[PDB]
From a paper:
To understand how the incorporation of PilW would alter the T4P fiber, we resolved the X-ray crystal structure of PilW, as a C-terminal fusion to maltose-binding protein (MBP) at 2.5 Å resolution. MBP crystallizes readily and can serve as a molecular chaperone to increase the propensity for crystallization, Fig. S2 shows the asymmetric unit of the MBP-PilW crystal, where contracts between MBP and PilW predominate. Fitting with the notion that MBP serves as a sort of molecular chaperone, the relative B-factors are lower for MBP than the majority of PilW, particularly the PilW surface loops. The majority of the two structures is superimposable, including the four strands of the PilA1 β-sheet and the C-terminal α-helix (which is also found in a superimposition of PilA1 and PilJ); the most obvious point of divergence is the αβ loop, which has a short helical section in PilA1, but adds two strands to the β-sheet of PilW. This loop appears to be highly flexible; in the four molecules of the PilW asymmetric unit, it can be traced in two distinct conformations (chains B and C), with insufficient density to resolve it in the other two. The conformer found in chain C of our crystal structure can be accommodated in our pilus model with only minor adjustments to the backbone, while the conformer in molecule B would require a total rearrangement, leading us to conclude that the chain C conformation is close to the native conformation found in the assembled fibers. When PilW subunits are modeled in, the αβ-loop of PilW extends into a groove between PilA1 subunits. Those residues which vary are clustered on the surface in regions which would be surface exposed on the assembled pilus. Notably, the lysine-rich portion of the αβ loop shown in Figure 4D (residues 67–72) is conserved across the alignment, supporting the hypothesis that this motif is important for DNA recognition. Equivalent residues in similar positions can be observed in the PilW structure, at Lysine 30 and Aspartate 85.
Residue numbers in the entry: 1 to 370, 1026 to 1152
C-alpha cells in the first residue's frame, strides 16, 4: 500500500508544484522525511480508484466540492486541528471542508467570480445590475458593448439568478438536504428574468460563450466581463488596462457566486497521518509556505488570514475574497451533477426563447430534485412495509397467527389515517400508529385462517412513481412483488415472507 515514513502529495498541474516541493525540502531538512510532490493527470479520478484499494498519495489537493464524495466512500481521514490553528483560517473556509459534522480537509485557497472591467472604457464600474442597460446604450453609441460573459454555463449566470433568493441545496446543521433545491423560487425567477430581459433588449446575445466573451474583453470591445482568477493572465498579455471588483448588486442584494475552496485531504489509508498534519499545519499553511507556492504559480485568495492580508495588496485578490464572502459555498455533494445539468438546460432554453422563465425553471427544479424526493418516498414506503411485517410477526409470537381476523386496511383521508371501522390489532404493544403512508394511498394486508405463509400486502399508491422508482422495488424484494395495472390505479402486492 502506502509506504510509511514518507509523504506523497498529489496536486494539479496548474498549481505551484515547484513551490510546494520547496516547502517539502524545508520539511525534509527539519525532520529527515522526504516529500514527493507529483502532479499526475486526471488526479480527480485517479485518487478514488487507487485510494479505495488502500493505495495512493498521503495528501491530495483538490477543490473542496469533490471531497464530500470522497468522504462518503470513506477515503478521507478526519483531521484534528487544534482550536488555535483553526482560528488562523477564515471560519467560512472551514465550512467548505465538512462532511457529516467532521472536518475532512484543510482549506488552502478561495476562489469566486468577479466583475472585470476596462478602465479606459469605464473608469467607474456600475454598482448595480439594474443600471447596466442604460450603460450599454451609452456605450453602443460609440461602438462598444457594456457586458459580455459566458451565458452557456450556469456557473457564470448563477450569481445573478441566486442574488434574490436562488440556492442549490439548503444547508442546515452540517448537512445539505438533497431534497430541497432553490431553482424555481421567486428570487431565482427574478434573477433569470433580468438575464433574459437583457438578451431580449439586445444588451447581450444568448450565444455568447467563454471564448467569445474572453476575446471581446481582451480586444477592448466590451467594457465589462465576468470571470475568475484563471483568466487574468490572458488579459495581461492583452495589455488592456483592466480592473477587478465586487459583482453588481441585484435588487440591492449582492451577487452570490459559487465559492470554490482548494483543499488538502489526508488519505484515510495513509500510515503517515501525523506527518501529513505536521506538514500541512506548520509548513504549508504559513506565510512562508503559501508564499513558496504562490511565487511558483499564484493561488488567488487564501484561507490563511495572515497571508491573505499580504496577497490582498493586489486589488484583484481583494475583490476575489469579497465576492467569495458574499457568495455561496459550492455544495460538496455528488447530487450537484443533476443540479448543473438542470440549471444549464433551463438558462439555455429561457435565453434562446425556447421556453418561458417559469417553464424553464419548473423543469429544472424537477430535473434537480425529483429523483431524490421519490427515493425518500420509496424508502418511507418500504419502512411502512417492514413495520407492518414486524407487527404481524409480533402478533404471531403472542397469538395464534399473523392477523386476528382476515384483513386490515389503512387508508389516509385528509391528514389522518383510518383503520376499517373499528380498531384492529387490539394491543398496547403494536398498533404501530406511525405509518407515514408517503403515497397517501391504501394498504391492505391479507391472510386466510389456516396454515400460514399467506402474508400479502396490497398497496394502491396515489401519485405516479417513476420507472426508476418501481424498478428500485424490484431489486429490493425480487419475485415477491407484483406491479399490476401499470397505468391508472397502479397496484403493488408484496408477500411479506
Amino acid at each position: 500500500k502506502i509506504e510509511e515514513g514518507k509523504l506523497v502529495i498529489w496536486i494539479n498541474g496548474d498549481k505551484g508544484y515547484n513551490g510546494l516541493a520547496e516547502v517539502g525540502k524545508k520539511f525534509e531538512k527539519d525532520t529527515g522525511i522526504k516529500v514527493t510532490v507529483e502532479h499526475p493527470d486526471k488526479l480527480e479520478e485517479k485518487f478514488p480508484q487507487v485510494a479505495a484499494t488502500g493505495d495512493g498519495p498521503d495528501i491530495i489537493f483538490w477543490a473542496h466540492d469533490r471531497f464530500g464524495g470522497y468522504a462518503q466512500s470513506g477515503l478521507l481521514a478526519e483531521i484534528t486541528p487544534a482550536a488555535a490553528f483553526q482560528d488562523k483560517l477564515y471560519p467560512f473556509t472551514w465550512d467548505a471542508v465538512r462532511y457529516n459534522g467532521k472536518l475532512i480537509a484543510y482549506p488552502i485557497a478561495v476562489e469566486a467570480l468577479s466583475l472585470i472591467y476596462n478602465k479606459d472604457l469605464l473608469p467607474n464600474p456600475p454598482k448595480t445590475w439594474e443600471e447596466i442597460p442604460a450603460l450599454d446604450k451609452e456605450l453602443k453609441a460609440k461602438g462598444k458593448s457594456a457586458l459580455m460573459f459566458n451565458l452557456q454555463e450556469p456557473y457564470f449566470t448563477w450569481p445573478l439568478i441566486a442574488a434574490d433568493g436562488g440556492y442549490a441545496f439548503k444547508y442546515a446543521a452540517g448537512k445539505y438536504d438533497i431534497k430541497d433545491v432553490g431553482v424555481d423560487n421567486a428570487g431565482a425567477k427574478a434573477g433569470l428574468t433580468f438575464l433574459v430581459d437583457l438578451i431580449k433588449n439586445k444588451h447581450m446575445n444568448a450565444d455568447t460563450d467563454y471564448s467569445i466573451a474572453e476575446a471581446a474583453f481582451n480586444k477592448g470591445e466590451t467594457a465589462m466581463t465576468i470571470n475568475g482568477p484563471w483568466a487574468w493572465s490572458n488579459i495581461d498579455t492583452s495589455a488592456v488596462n483592466y480592473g477587478v471588483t465586487v459583482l453588481p448588486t441585484f435588487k440591492g442584494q449582492p451577487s452570490k457566486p459559487f465559492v470554490g475552496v482548494l483543499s488538502a485531504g489526508i488519505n484515510a489509508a495513509s500510515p503517515n497521518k501525523e506527518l501529513a498534519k505536521e506538514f500541512l499545519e506548520n509548513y504549508l499553511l504559513t506565510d512562508e509556505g503559501l508564499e513558496a507556492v504562490n511565487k511558483d504559480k499564484p493561488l488567488g485568495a487564501v484561507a490563511l488570514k495572515s497571508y491573505e492580508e499580504e496577497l490582498a495588496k493586489d486589488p484583484r485578490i481583494a475583490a476575489t475574497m469579497e465576492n467569495a464572502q458574499k457568495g455561496e459555498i459550492m455544495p460538496n455533494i455528488p447530487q450537484m451533477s443533476a443540479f448543473w445539468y438542470a440549471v444549464r438546460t433551463a438558462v439555455i432554453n429561457a435565453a434562446s426563447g425556447r421556453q418561458t422563465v417559469d417553464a424553464a425553471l419548473a423543469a429544472a427544479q424537477t430535473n434537480a430534485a425529483a429523483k431524490n424526493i421519490e427515493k425518500a418516498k420509496i424508502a418511507k414506503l418500504e419502512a411502512d412495509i417492514s413495520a407492518i411485517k414486524s407487527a404481524s410477526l409480533s402478533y404471531y409470537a403472542d397469538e395464534s397467527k399473523y392477523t386476528d381476523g382476515g384483513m386490515i386496511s389503512w387508508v389516509k383521508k385528509d391528514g389522518k389515517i383510518i383503520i376499517n371501522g373499528g380498531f384492529k390489532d387490539d394491543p398496547l404493544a403494536d398498533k404501530i400508529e406511525n405509518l407515514g403512508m408517503p403515497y397517501n394511498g391504501s394498504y391492505l394486508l391479507m391472510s386466510s385462517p389456516g396454515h400460514e405463509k399467506y402474508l400479502e400486502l396490497s398497496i394502491l399508491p396515489e401519485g405516479e412513481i417513476s420507472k426508476s422508482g418501481l424498478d428500485k422495488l424490484k431489486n429490493d424484494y425480487g419475485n415477491l412483488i407484483d406491479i399490476t395495472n401499470d397505468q391508472n390505479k397502479i397496484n403493488i402486492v408484496i408477500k411479506l415472507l
